[PDB]
Coordinates of C-alpha atoms in Angstrom, one line a residue:
Chain A
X1 CA -4.7 1.4 -14.3
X2 CA -1.7 -0.1 -12.5
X3 CA -1.4 -2.0 -9.3
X4 CA 0.9 -1.2 -6.4
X5 CA 1.5 -2.2 -2.8
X6 CA -0.3 0.7 -1.4
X7 CA -0.3 1.9 2.1
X8 CA -2.8 4.1 3.9
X9 CA -2.0 7.8 4.2
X10 CA -0.2 8.1 7.6
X11 CA -1.0 11.7 8.8
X12 CA -3.6 10.8 11.4
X13 CA -1.0 8.3 12.9
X14 CA 2.0 10.7 12.8
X15 CA 0.2 12.9 15.4
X16 CA 0.1 10.1 17.9
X17 CA 3.8 9.2 17.8
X18 CA 5.9 10.0 20.9
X19 CA 9.2 8.9 22.4
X20 CA 9.4 7.0 25.7
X21 CA 12.6 6.5 27.8
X22 CA 13.3 4.4 30.9
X23 CA 16.8 4.3 32.1
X24 CA 18.9 4.2 28.9
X25 CA 16.3 2.3 26.8
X26 CA 14.4 4.5 24.3
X27 CA 11.6 3.4 22.1
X28 CA 8.4 4.8 20.6
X29 CA 4.9 5.1 22.1
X30 CA 1.4 5.9 20.8
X31 CA -0.5 8.7 22.5
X32 CA -4.3 8.5 22.3
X33 CA -6.4 10.8 24.5
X34 CA -4.5 10.9 27.8
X35 CA -2.7 7.5 27.5
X36 CA 0.5 6.5 25.9
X37 CA 1.0 2.8 25.0
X38 CA 4.4 1.2 24.4
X39 CA 6.2 -2.3 24.7
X40 CA 6.8 -3.2 28.3
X41 CA 10.3 -4.1 27.6
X42 CA 11.1 -0.5 27.7
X43 CA 11.8 -1.0 31.5
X44 CA 14.5 -3.6 30.8
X45 CA 18.3 -3.1 30.5
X46 CA 20.3 -5.5 28.1
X47 CA 21.2 -7.9 31.0
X48 CA 17.5 -8.0 32.1
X49 CA 16.3 -8.9 28.6
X50 CA 17.4 -12.5 28.7
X51 CA 15.3 -13.6 31.8
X52 CA 13.0 -10.7 32.7
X53 CA 10.3 -10.8 35.3
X54 CA 8.1 -7.8 34.4
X55 CA 5.8 -8.0 37.4
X56 CA 8.9 -7.7 39.5
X57 CA 10.8 -5.1 37.4
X58 CA 7.8 -2.8 37.2
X59 CA 7.0 -2.5 41.0
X60 CA 10.6 -1.1 41.2
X61 CA 9.5 1.9 39.1
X62 CA 7.4 5.0 39.7
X63 CA 5.7 7.4 37.3
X64 CA 8.8 9.6 37.2
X65 CA 10.9 6.7 36.0
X66 CA 9.3 7.4 32.6
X67 CA 10.2 10.3 30.2
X68 CA 7.6 11.1 27.5
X69 CA 8.6 13.6 24.8
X70 CA 6.2 14.6 22.0
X71 CA 8.3 16.7 19.6
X72 CA 9.8 19.1 22.1
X73 CA 7.1 19.2 24.8
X74 CA 7.7 16.9 27.9
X75 CA 4.6 15.1 29.0
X76 CA 4.3 14.3 32.6
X77 CA 3.4 10.7 33.7
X78 CA 0.8 10.4 36.4
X79 CA 0.0 6.7 36.2
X80 CA 1.2 3.4 34.9
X81 CA -0.2 -0.1 34.5
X82 CA 1.0 -3.2 32.7
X83 CA -1.3 -4.8 30.1
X84 CA -0.1 -8.0 28.9
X85 CA 3.0 -7.1 27.0
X86 CA 2.4 -3.4 26.9
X87 CA 2.5 -0.5 29.4
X88 CA -0.2 2.2 29.8
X89 CA 1.0 5.6 30.9
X90 CA -1.6 8.2 31.9
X91 CA -0.2 11.6 31.2
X92 CA -1.4 15.2 32.1
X93 CA -2.3 16.3 28.5
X94 CA -4.9 14.8 26.3
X95 CA -3.6 14.6 22.7
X96 CA -5.2 17.4 20.7
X97 CA -4.5 15.3 17.6
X98 CA -6.3 12.1 18.8
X99 CA -8.2 10.8 15.7
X100 CA -11.4 8.7 15.7
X101 CA -10.0 5.2 16.4
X102 CA -10.4 1.6 17.7
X103 CA -8.3 -1.4 18.4
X104 CA -8.8 -4.7 16.5
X105 CA -7.0 -8.0 16.6
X106 CA -6.3 -9.1 13.0
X107 CA -6.3 -12.5 11.5
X108 CA -3.5 -14.1 9.6
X109 CA -3.6 -13.2 5.9
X110 CA -5.0 -9.8 6.7
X111 CA -3.1 -6.7 5.7
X112 CA -2.1 -3.3 7.1
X113 CA 0.3 -0.3 7.0
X114 CA 3.2 0.2 9.3
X115 CA 4.7 3.6 10.2
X116 CA 8.3 3.0 11.0
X117 CA 9.6 5.4 13.8
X118 CA 12.8 6.1 15.5
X119 CA 13.0 8.3 18.7
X120 CA 9.3 9.2 18.3
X121 CA 10.0 10.5 14.8
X122 CA 8.1 8.8 11.8
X123 CA 10.7 7.8 9.2
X124 CA 8.6 5.8 6.7
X125 CA 5.4 4.0 5.7
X126 CA 4.9 0.6 4.0
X127 CA 2.3 -2.1 3.5
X128 CA 2.4 -5.5 5.2
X129 CA 0.6 -8.8 5.5
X130 CA 0.2 -10.7 8.8
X131 CA 1.8 -14.0 7.8
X132 CA 0.2 -17.4 8.6
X133 CA 3.1 -18.1 11.0
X134 CA 2.2 -14.8 12.6
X135 CA 5.3 -12.8 11.7
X136 CA 5.6 -9.9 9.3
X137 CA 8.4 -9.3 6.7
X138 CA 8.9 -5.8 7.9
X139 CA 11.9 -3.5 7.8
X140 CA 13.0 -2.4 11.2
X141 CA 16.2 -1.3 12.8
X142 CA 17.1 -1.0 16.5
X143 CA 14.9 1.7 18.2
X144 CA 11.8 0.9 16.0
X145 CA 9.8 -0.9 18.8
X146 CA 6.4 0.8 19.4
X147 CA 6.0 1.5 15.7
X148 CA 2.4 0.6 14.8
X149 CA 0.4 -1.1 12.1
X150 CA -3.0 0.2 11.1
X151 CA -5.9 0.5 8.7
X152 CA -8.2 3.3 7.9
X153 CA -11.9 2.8 7.3
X154 CA -13.3 6.1 6.4
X155 CA -12.4 8.5 9.1
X156 CA -11.4 5.9 11.7
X157 CA -8.0 4.4 12.5
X158 CA -8.0 0.7 13.3
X159 CA -4.8 0.0 15.3
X160 CA -3.9 -3.7 15.0
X161 CA -0.1 -4.0 15.6
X162 CA 2.7 -2.8 17.8
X163 CA 6.3 -3.8 17.1
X164 CA 8.3 -5.6 19.9
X165 CA 11.0 -7.7 18.4
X166 CA 13.0 -9.3 15.6
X167 CA 13.5 -13.0 15.0
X168 CA 16.6 -14.8 13.9
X169 CA 15.0 -15.2 10.4
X170 CA 15.1 -11.4 10.1
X171 CA 11.3 -11.2 10.4
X172 CA 9.2 -9.3 13.0
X173 CA 6.9 -10.2 15.9
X174 CA 4.6 -7.9 17.9
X175 CA 1.3 -7.4 19.4
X176 CA -2.1 -6.0 19.2
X177 CA -2.9 -2.9 21.2
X178 CA -4.0 -4.9 24.1
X179 CA -0.6 -6.4 24.6
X180 CA -1.4 -9.9 23.3
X181 CA 1.3 -11.2 21.0
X182 CA 0.5 -12.5 17.5
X183 CA 2.1 -16.0 17.5
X184 CA 3.6 -18.2 20.3
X185 CA 6.4 -15.6 20.9
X186 CA 7.2 -13.9 24.2
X187 CA 9.1 -10.7 24.9
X188 CA 12.5 -12.3 26.0
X189 CA 15.9 -12.7 24.2
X190 CA 15.8 -16.5 24.0
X191 CA 15.9 -19.2 21.4
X192 CA 12.6 -18.6 19.4
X193 CA 12.0 -19.2 15.7
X194 CA 9.3 -18.6 13.2
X195 CA 7.1 -21.6 12.6
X196 CA 7.2 -22.5 8.9
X197 CA 5.0 -20.3 6.8
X198 CA 2.5 -21.0 4.0
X199 CA 1.3 -19.0 1.0
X200 CA -2.0 -17.1 1.4
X201 CA -4.2 -18.8 -1.1
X202 CA -7.2 -16.4 -0.7
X203 CA -4.8 -13.5 -1.6
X204 CA -3.2 -15.1 -4.6
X205 CA -6.7 -15.5 -6.0
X206 CA -7.6 -11.9 -5.2
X207 CA -4.5 -10.9 -7.1
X208 CA -5.4 -13.0 -10.1
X209 CA -8.8 -11.3 -10.1
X210 CA -7.0 -8.0 -10.1
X211 CA -5.0 -8.9 -13.3
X212 CA -8.2 -9.7 -15.2
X213 CA -10.0 -6.5 -14.0
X214 CA -6.9 -4.6 -15.3
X215 CA -7.4 -6.5 -18.5
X216 CA -4.9 -9.4 -18.6
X217 CA -6.3 -12.9 -19.3
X218 CA -3.4 -15.1 -20.5
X219 CA -3.2 -17.4 -17.4
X220 CA -6.9 -18.5 -17.7
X221 CA -7.7 -22.1 -19.0
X222 CA -10.9 -24.1 -19.9
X223 CA -10.9 -26.3 -16.8
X224 CA -12.8 -26.3 -13.6
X225 CA -12.0 -28.1 -10.4
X226 CA -13.5 -29.5 -7.2
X227 CA -12.5 -27.7 -4.1
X228 CA -11.0 -30.9 -2.7
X229 CA -9.0 -31.7 -5.9
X230 CA -7.5 -28.2 -5.7
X231 CA -6.5 -28.7 -2.1
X232 CA -4.7 -32.0 -2.8
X233 CA -2.6 -29.9 -5.2
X234 CA -2.4 -26.9 -2.9
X235 CA -0.9 -29.0 -0.1
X236 CA 2.0 -30.1 -2.3
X237 CA 3.0 -26.6 -3.1
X238 CA 2.6 -25.3 0.5
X239 CA -0.5 -23.2 0.0
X240 CA -3.2 -22.8 2.7
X241 CA -6.2 -25.0 1.9
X242 CA -9.0 -23.2 0.2
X243 CA -12.3 -23.3 2.2
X244 CA -15.9 -22.5 1.3
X245 CA -15.7 -19.2 3.3
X246 CA -12.8 -18.1 1.2
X247 CA -14.7 -19.0 -2.0
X248 CA -17.6 -16.9 -0.8
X249 CA -15.4 -13.9 -0.1
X250 CA -14.3 -14.0 -3.7
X251 CA -18.0 -13.5 -4.8
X252 CA -18.0 -9.8 -5.9
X253 CA -14.7 -10.2 -7.7
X254 CA -16.2 -13.3 -9.4
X255 CA -19.3 -11.2 -10.2
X256 CA -17.3 -8.3 -11.6
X257 CA -15.1 -10.4 -14.0
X258 CA -17.7 -13.2 -14.8
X259 CA -15.0 -15.8 -13.8
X260 CA -16.2 -18.5 -11.4
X261 CA -14.0 -19.0 -8.4
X262 CA -13.5 -22.7 -9.1
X263 CA -12.6 -21.8 -12.7
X264 CA -9.9 -19.5 -11.2
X265 CA -8.6 -22.2 -8.9
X266 CA -8.2 -24.3 -12.1
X267 CA -6.2 -21.5 -13.5
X268 CA -4.0 -21.5 -10.4
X269 CA -3.8 -25.2 -10.3
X270 CA -2.3 -24.9 -13.8
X271 CA 0.2 -22.1 -12.8
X272 CA 1.5 -24.1 -9.9
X273 CA 2.0 -27.1 -12.1
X274 CA 3.5 -25.5 -15.3
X275 CA 5.1 -22.3 -14.1
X276 CA 4.5 -18.9 -15.8
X277 CA 6.7 -19.5 -18.8
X278 CA 9.0 -16.6 -17.8
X279 CA 6.0 -14.2 -18.2
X280 CA 4.4 -11.7 -15.8
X281 CA 1.1 -11.0 -14.0
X282 CA 0.6 -7.4 -13.1
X283 CA 4.4 -6.9 -13.4
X284 CA 5.3 -9.9 -11.3
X285 CA 7.2 -13.1 -12.4
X286 CA 5.8 -14.7 -9.2
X287 CA 2.5 -15.3 -7.6
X288 CA 1.7 -12.5 -5.2
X289 CA 0.1 -13.1 -1.8
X290 CA 0.0 -9.8 0.1
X291 CA -3.2 -8.3 -1.4
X292 CA -6.5 -9.4 0.2
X293 CA -9.8 -9.4 -1.7
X294 CA -10.7 -6.1 0.0
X295 CA -7.3 -4.7 -1.1
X296 CA -8.2 -5.4 -4.6
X297 CA -11.7 -3.9 -4.5
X298 CA -10.3 -0.6 -2.9
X299 CA -7.4 -0.1 -5.4
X300 CA -9.0 -1.4 -8.6
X301 CA -11.6 0.0 -10.9
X302 CA -15.2 -1.0 -10.2
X303 CA -15.4 -1.5 -14.0
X304 CA -13.5 -4.4 -15.7
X305 CA -11.4 -3.6 -18.8
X306 CA -13.1 -6.4 -20.9
Chain B
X1 CA 18.7 -15.6 19.5
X2 CA 16.0 -12.9 19.4
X3 CA 16.2 -9.1 19.3
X4 CA 13.8 -6.7 21.1
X5 CA 14.1 -3.3 19.2
Chain C
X1 CA 16.8 -6.1 9.3
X2 CA 14.5 -6.5 6.2
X3 CA 14.1 -4.3 3.1
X4 CA 10.9 -2.9 1.9
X5 CA 9.7 -0.4 -0.8
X6 CA 9.2 2.4 1.7
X7 CA 7.5 5.7 1.2
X8 CA 7.8 8.9 3.1
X9 CA 5.2 9.6 5.8
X10 CA 2.5 11.6 4.1
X11 CA 1.0 13.8 6.8
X12 CA 2.6 17.1 5.8
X13 CA 1.3 16.5 2.3
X14 CA -2.3 15.5 3.3
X15 CA -2.8 19.0 4.7
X16 CA -2.2 20.6 1.2
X17 CA -4.7 18.5 -0.7
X18 CA -7.8 20.2 -2.1
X19 CA -10.4 19.6 -4.8
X20 CA -10.8 21.9 -7.8
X21 CA -13.8 21.9 -10.1
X22 CA -14.3 23.7 -13.5
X23 CA -17.6 23.0 -15.3
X24 CA -18.0 19.3 -14.7
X25 CA -14.3 18.3 -14.5
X26 CA -13.1 17.6 -11.0
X27 CA -9.5 16.9 -10.0
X28 CA -7.1 17.5 -7.1
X29 CA -5.0 20.6 -6.3
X30 CA -2.1 21.5 -4.0
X31 CA -2.5 24.4 -1.6
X32 CA 0.6 26.1 -0.5
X33 CA 0.5 29.5 1.3
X34 CA -2.2 31.4 -0.7
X35 CA -1.9 29.5 -4.1
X36 CA -3.4 26.2 -5.3
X37 CA -1.7 24.4 -8.2
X38 CA -3.5 21.9 -10.5
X39 CA -3.3 20.5 -14.1
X40 CA -4.5 23.0 -16.6
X41 CA -6.7 20.4 -18.2
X42 CA -9.1 21.0 -15.5
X43 CA -10.7 23.7 -17.8
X44 CA -11.4 21.1 -20.6
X45 CA -14.5 19.1 -21.4
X46 CA -14.2 15.7 -22.9
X47 CA -14.7 17.1 -26.5
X48 CA -12.0 19.8 -25.8
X49 CA -9.5 17.3 -24.7
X50 CA -8.6 16.0 -28.2
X51 CA -7.4 19.4 -29.7
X52 CA -7.3 21.9 -26.8
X53 CA -6.0 25.4 -27.1
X54 CA -5.3 26.4 -23.5
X55 CA -4.4 30.0 -24.1
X56 CA -7.8 30.3 -25.8
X57 CA -9.9 28.2 -23.4
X58 CA -8.5 30.1 -20.4
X59 CA -9.3 33.7 -21.5
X60 CA -13.0 32.4 -21.6
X61 CA -12.8 31.9 -17.8
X62 CA -12.9 34.1 -14.7
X63 CA -11.9 33.5 -11.1
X64 CA -15.4 32.4 -10.2
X65 CA -15.3 29.7 -12.9
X66 CA -13.1 27.8 -10.3
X67 CA -14.5 26.0 -7.2
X68 CA -11.9 25.2 -4.5
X69 CA -13.1 23.0 -1.6
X70 CA -10.7 22.0 1.3
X71 CA -12.6 19.5 3.3
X72 CA -15.8 21.4 3.8
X73 CA -14.6 25.0 3.6
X74 CA -15.0 26.8 0.2
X75 CA -12.0 28.8 -0.8
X76 CA -12.5 31.9 -2.9
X77 CA -10.5 32.3 -6.0
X78 CA -9.1 35.8 -6.6
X79 CA -6.5 35.2 -9.4
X80 CA -5.5 32.7 -12.0
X81 CA -2.5 32.3 -14.3
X82 CA -1.3 29.5 -16.6
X83 CA 2.1 28.1 -15.9
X84 CA 3.2 25.8 -18.6
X85 CA 0.9 22.8 -18.0
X86 CA -0.5 24.0 -14.7
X87 CA -2.8 26.6 -13.3
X88 CA -2.1 28.9 -10.3
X89 CA -5.0 30.0 -8.3
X90 CA -4.6 32.8 -5.8
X91 CA -7.2 32.3 -3.0
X92 CA -8.3 34.4 0.0
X93 CA -6.9 32.1 2.7
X94 CA -3.3 31.2 3.3
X95 CA -3.0 27.5 4.2
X96 CA -2.5 27.2 8.0
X97 CA -0.9 23.8 7.3
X98 CA 1.6 24.9 4.7
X99 CA 4.9 23.0 5.5
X100 CA 8.4 24.1 4.9
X101 CA 8.9 23.1 1.2
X102 CA 10.5 23.6 -2.2
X103 CA 10.0 22.5 -5.8
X104 CA 12.7 20.5 -7.6
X105 CA 12.8 18.8 -11.0
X106 CA 14.0 15.2 -10.6
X107 CA 16.2 13.2 -12.9
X108 CA 15.4 9.8 -14.4
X109 CA 16.3 7.0 -12.0
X110 CA 15.5 9.1 -9.0
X111 CA 12.8 8.0 -6.6
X112 CA 9.8 9.5 -4.7
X113 CA 6.5 9.0 -2.9
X114 CA 3.1 9.5 -4.4
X115 CA -0.1 10.4 -2.5
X116 CA -3.0 9.1 -4.5
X117 CA -6.1 11.3 -4.1
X118 CA -9.6 11.4 -5.4
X119 CA -11.9 14.5 -4.9
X120 CA -9.3 16.2 -2.8
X121 CA -9.3 13.2 -0.4
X122 CA -6.0 11.2 0.1
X123 CA -6.6 7.5 -0.6
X124 CA -3.1 6.0 -0.4
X125 CA 0.7 6.3 -0.4
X126 CA 3.3 4.3 -2.4
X127 CA 6.9 4.6 -3.6
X128 CA 7.9 5.2 -7.2
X129 CA 10.9 5.7 -9.5
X130 CA 11.0 8.1 -12.4
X131 CA 11.7 5.7 -15.3
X132 CA 14.4 6.4 -18.0
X133 CA 11.6 6.8 -20.5
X134 CA 10.2 9.4 -18.1
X135 CA 7.0 7.5 -17.1
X136 CA 6.1 6.1 -13.8
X137 CA 4.5 2.7 -13.0
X138 CA 1.9 4.2 -10.8
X139 CA -1.5 3.2 -9.8
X140 CA -4.1 5.7 -10.7
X141 CA -7.8 5.8 -11.6
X142 CA -9.9 8.6 -13.2
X143 CA -10.0 11.6 -10.9
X144 CA -6.4 11.1 -9.6
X145 CA -4.9 14.0 -11.6
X146 CA -3.2 16.6 -9.3
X147 CA -1.9 13.8 -7.0
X148 CA 1.7 14.7 -6.2
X149 CA 5.0 13.0 -5.7
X150 CA 7.5 14.1 -3.1
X151 CA 10.5 13.6 -0.9
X152 CA 11.2 14.7 2.6
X153 CA 14.6 15.9 3.6
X154 CA 14.4 16.6 7.3
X155 CA 11.6 19.0 7.8
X156 CA 11.3 20.0 4.2
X157 CA 9.0 18.7 1.4
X158 CA 10.5 18.5 -2.0
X159 CA 7.6 18.5 -4.5
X160 CA 8.8 17.0 -7.7
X161 CA 5.7 15.5 -9.5
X162 CA 2.1 16.2 -10.4
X163 CA -0.1 13.7 -12.2
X164 CA -1.7 14.7 -15.5
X165 CA -2.4 11.5 -17.6
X166 CA -2.2 7.8 -18.4
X167 CA -0.6 6.3 -21.5
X168 CA -1.8 3.4 -23.5
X169 CA 0.9 1.2 -21.9
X170 CA -1.0 1.7 -18.6
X171 CA 1.8 3.9 -17.2
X172 CA 1.7 7.5 -16.1
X173 CA 3.0 10.9 -17.2
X174 CA 3.0 14.2 -15.4
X175 CA 4.9 17.3 -14.5
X176 CA 7.1 19.1 -12.1
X177 CA 5.5 21.8 -10.0
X178 CA 6.4 24.4 -12.6
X179 CA 4.3 22.7 -15.2
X180 CA 7.0 21.3 -17.4
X181 CA 6.3 17.7 -18.4
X182 CA 8.7 14.9 -17.7
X183 CA 9.2 13.3 -21.2
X184 CA 8.1 14.4 -24.7
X185 CA 4.4 14.1 -23.8
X186 CA 1.8 16.9 -24.0
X187 CA -1.6 17.3 -22.2
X188 CA -3.8 16.2 -25.1
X189 CA -5.8 12.9 -25.8
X190 CA -3.8 11.9 -28.9
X191 CA -1.6 9.0 -30.2
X192 CA 1.4 9.1 -27.7
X193 CA 3.4 6.2 -26.4
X194 CA 6.1 5.5 -23.9
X195 CA 9.5 5.4 -25.4
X196 CA 11.1 2.1 -24.7
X197 CA 12.6 1.9 -21.2
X198 CA 15.9 0.6 -19.8
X199 CA 16.8 -0.9 -16.4
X200 CA 18.4 1.6 -13.9
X201 CA 21.9 0.2 -13.5
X202 CA 22.9 2.5 -10.7
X203 CA 19.9 1.3 -8.6
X204 CA 20.4 -2.4 -9.2
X205 CA 23.9 -2.0 -7.8
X206 CA 22.6 0.0 -4.8
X207 CA 20.3 -3.0 -4.2
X208 CA 23.0 -5.5 -4.4
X209 CA 25.0 -3.5 -1.8
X210 CA 21.8 -3.6 0.4
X211 CA 21.8 -7.4 0.2
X212 CA 25.4 -7.7 1.5
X213 CA 24.8 -5.0 4.3
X214 CA 21.9 -7.2 5.3
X215 CA 24.3 -10.1 5.3
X216 CA 23.7 -12.1 2.1
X217 CA 26.8 -12.8 -0.1
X218 CA 26.0 -15.7 -2.4
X219 CA 25.9 -13.7 -5.7
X220 CA 29.5 -12.4 -5.3
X221 CA 32.4 -13.9 -7.4
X222 CA 36.2 -13.6 -7.7
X223 CA 36.2 -11.5 -10.8
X224 CA 36.7 -7.8 -11.6
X225 CA 35.8 -6.0 -14.8
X226 CA 36.7 -2.9 -16.8
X227 CA 33.9 -0.3 -16.9
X228 CA 33.9 -0.7 -20.7
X229 CA 33.7 -4.5 -20.7
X230 CA 30.7 -4.3 -18.3
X231 CA 29.0 -1.8 -20.6
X232 CA 29.4 -4.1 -23.6
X233 CA 27.5 -6.7 -21.6
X234 CA 25.0 -4.1 -20.1
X235 CA 23.9 -3.0 -23.6
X236 CA 22.9 -6.5 -24.6
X237 CA 20.6 -6.9 -21.6
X238 CA 19.1 -3.4 -21.9
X239 CA 20.7 -1.8 -18.9
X240 CA 21.8 1.9 -18.8
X241 CA 25.5 2.3 -19.3
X242 CA 27.5 2.6 -16.1
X243 CA 29.5 5.8 -16.0
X244 CA 32.2 7.1 -13.7
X245 CA 29.8 9.4 -11.8
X246 CA 27.6 6.4 -11.0
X247 CA 30.7 4.5 -9.8
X248 CA 31.6 7.4 -7.5
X249 CA 28.1 7.7 -6.0
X250 CA 28.5 4.0 -4.9
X251 CA 31.6 5.0 -2.8
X252 CA 30.1 5.0 0.7
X253 CA 28.4 1.7 0.1
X254 CA 31.6 0.3 -1.3
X255 CA 33.4 1.6 1.8
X256 CA 30.7 0.1 4.2
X257 CA 30.9 -3.5 2.7
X258 CA 34.5 -3.5 1.5
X259 CA 33.3 -4.5 -2.0
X260 CA 34.9 -2.5 -4.8
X261 CA 32.3 -1.2 -7.3
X262 CA 34.0 -2.9 -10.2
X263 CA 34.0 -6.2 -8.3
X264 CA 30.2 -5.7 -7.8
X265 CA 29.7 -5.0 -11.5
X266 CA 31.5 -8.4 -12.1
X267 CA 29.0 -9.9 -9.8
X268 CA 26.1 -8.4 -11.9
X269 CA 27.8 -9.3 -15.2
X270 CA 27.6 -12.9 -13.9
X271 CA 23.9 -12.7 -12.7
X272 CA 22.9 -11.3 -16.1
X273 CA 24.7 -14.1 -17.8
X274 CA 23.8 -17.2 -15.7
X275 CA 20.5 -16.2 -14.0
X276 CA 19.9 -16.5 -10.3
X277 CA 19.4 -20.3 -10.2
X278 CA 15.8 -19.9 -8.9
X279 CA 17.2 -18.2 -5.8
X280 CA 16.4 -14.9 -4.2
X281 CA 18.1 -11.6 -3.3
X282 CA 16.4 -9.7 -0.5
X283 CA 13.3 -11.7 -1.1
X284 CA 13.3 -11.1 -4.9
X285 CA 13.7 -13.6 -7.7
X286 CA 14.6 -10.7 -10.0
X287 CA 17.0 -7.8 -10.0
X288 CA 15.4 -4.8 -8.5
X289 CA 15.9 -1.3 -9.8
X290 CA 13.7 1.1 -7.8
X291 CA 16.0 1.8 -4.9
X292 CA 18.7 4.5 -5.4
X293 CA 22.0 4.5 -3.4
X294 CA 20.4 7.2 -1.2
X295 CA 17.4 4.9 -0.6
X296 CA 19.7 2.2 0.6
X297 CA 21.7 4.4 3.0
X298 CA 18.5 5.8 4.6
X299 CA 16.7 2.4 5.1
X300 CA 19.7 0.2 5.9
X301 CA 21.8 -0.1 9.0
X302 CA 25.0 2.0 9.0
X303 CA 26.7 -1.3 10.3
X304 CA 27.2 -4.3 8.0
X305 CA 26.2 -7.7 9.2
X306 CA 29.6 -9.3 8.3
Chain D
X1 CA -5.0 6.9 -27.3
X2 CA -4.1 8.8 -24.0
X3 CA -6.1 9.4 -20.8
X4 CA -6.0 12.6 -18.8
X5 CA -7.3 11.7 -15.2

């Protein structure tokens, strides 16, 4: 019993972290097989960072402009390409610790673990959601760039995020492992701002199902709702609209607790309207939107405490 | 502004 | 910038997890050098668990009553002693992945990471505090026993917790790596209950210092307080009393933000009295007690955003 | 009661 923001064990990822230096900029990279990936802004000095041209800054570098240390051992660079907003460095050693892995782009609302690193050296692990406005509420200091986000499905590491920058809001922006940003952001120090965000409706509902599976029922009520009547209410409280696809994803959690989705929306409709009455759901005095339905199936018991 | 890290 | 409940990277611990079976009870163990530790209740059947005598159940077992699998490889047991509420199994292989490590007993209010495992197989990592009433608000299913808590200081793993059981509250109880429980609990299925808990005053104050270092100041006020006048207030809101030792530990955070401790207590005294006015501190609408002062120095910038 | 896990 219990319910925590749980991250994936990080070992398989720790073995791919390295440090990458260019001039006097140092950040982290990820070493898979014989390639090291990192943000391309590693080739910038502070002056460059306001108006960089990467095509043009990169041709002014050779392989030996890049230092790659893994622990103690120096890795020699023998190749370099730009890929969108990342670099790819071919090196002379293949990483003996390369795990089974793949790269996926994730969708807003989805969730993942972040391994925070400084100077190629893992410092911590925590669990995140990709926000609707495409930021993350991470925790990062200077030198954290090239820290990655991931999931584990069985034996396989799904890399989905690389850290590039921090917004004025204090939130973070980055990239998939192909170099394509999440969001409208660009790797430059200019005026740039998070779009306004929204609460992840699908997730809140997942989290209410988790409360019930754990054996708490107080927030339920006897009503039902039409999808459209819910959405009229959702829009006024800045929630994402619920769609039919979202309703279908909540199927097995519906099946496990015998609560119909639309009954649960009615429950939420009520919580939004009347507050919680200074009470808690799974420990929280607020409605929690950073567990997906999948996050709830994995952590929770397959048997409801009825 | 914006801070690359 | 940002502030998350951050756990330690878990790799060095993943390599010590194994599975341990006795009869038809299976739980996890920790393999350091040539020893595997696990809860002693692994030698119990469901009937045994209500009134066990361990001295007596254990003499009725030999080395080959215990199956130890690490991944695929079977490890042969060549020795077994009871140690308080743990077993120690000498095996034929020394763990090639044994990290530098030590065992420490931790004090209430202190904090640590938990690697949740089922059948010797790490499933997740999250960050915990040892509560004043000696429980933890973990997340554990059946088969999680022998999951361990830890800290990392540099290169060294400080093991401080092993999971044994779950209380009626839904919270968790266990042991140091010497077998001595935290709390008055015993490894039996009887009537047993958490003592009432208290909020960790030292930690709340750490967390307020973290808000300021991150650059938020709204909750401050112009008052100061005597330690004793604060405590009179603290006791009515079920906070631990503040002591002089706690005040001294908050020294470097005082020094970094130029806020005197006793000024910060006055700030808290005020928050307890008037609420937050539906506002947030570091994202939270409530006062957060699971970061220690050390947790704040490690995660936060050494430079205040003034 | 109490649940050893």
